[PDB]
Paper text:
Here, we report the selection of single-domain antibodies (single-dAbs) based on a human scaffold that recognize the catalytic domain of HOIP, a subunit of the multi-component E3 LUBAC and member of the RBR family of E3 ligases. A multi-protein E3 complex called LUBAC (linear ubiquitin chain assembly complex) is the only known E3 ligase able to generate polyubiquitin chains via M1 (Kirisako et al., 2006). In contrast, RING2 is structurally close to an IBR-fold and encompasses a catalytic cysteine that forms a ubiquitin thioester intermediate before ubiquitin transfer onto a substrate (Stieglitz et al., 2013).
The RBR/dAb3 complex yielded three-dimensional crystals under two different conditions (see the STAR Methods), one of which contained only dAb3. To investigate if the oligomeric states seen in the crystal structures also occur in solution, apo dAb3, HOIP RBR and the HOIP RBR/dAb3 complexes were evaluated by SEC-MALLS. Of the ten dAbs selected, dAb3 readily produced crystals in the apo and RBR-bound form.
Residue numbers in the entry:
A (entry chain A): 1 to 120
B (entry chain B): 1 to 119
The structure:
Amino acid sequence: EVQLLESGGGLVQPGGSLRLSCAASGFTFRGYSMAWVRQAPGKGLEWVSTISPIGTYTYYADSVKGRFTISRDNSKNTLYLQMNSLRAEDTAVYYCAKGSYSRGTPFDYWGQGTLVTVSS
Amino acid sequence: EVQLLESGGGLVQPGGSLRLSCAASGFTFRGYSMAWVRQAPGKGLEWVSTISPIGTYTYYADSVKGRFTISRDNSKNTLYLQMNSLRAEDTAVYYCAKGSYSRGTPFDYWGQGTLVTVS
């Protein structure tokens, strides 16, 4: 019943822009921190950004500061990642992540992934 | 250098049992928590269970607590998931995932997945 539905990936040249979206079902956004993580080809998962439940606080990996913006719309149950000044090294599958209050993990649900290709 | 390979998936009758395993390479296995996550048809990834480095602590999603048991054998770099009383809701690709101590990533690698269908 819990679902995180991603969209927005695509193919761009360096300097391009994309907006990822993550629509949620089966829980209400307001209660939870949300995050974006990404897996670059042949690498391990890397954290991108986290946003607090009401959006008061946002956090960014050093590699995306000033270029990416996380935001959320709690009445829409949707999480966003605005990606500007895209770099080849941003090429990755991007996942949204639902914050959790369980002691077994700080995030207990992830989207299905959307591919971001920055090339040429 | 991290690599994870799940085994044991298959077709299971409703109410049946199945044991999955996960073999790991490229890291000191006993140094990390490990987890199972699963992807049902049409959905994203759902956290299933976590086990601590030596197995002292285990944690479960509410919908599998009790009928699932996570365990590990650190000398063989292997993680296990015993699944009992399986139901249609459990149909999914099951992945094992390596824990991480890095900011914002509780897990940093996960495996190829093994498919379990309950019907």
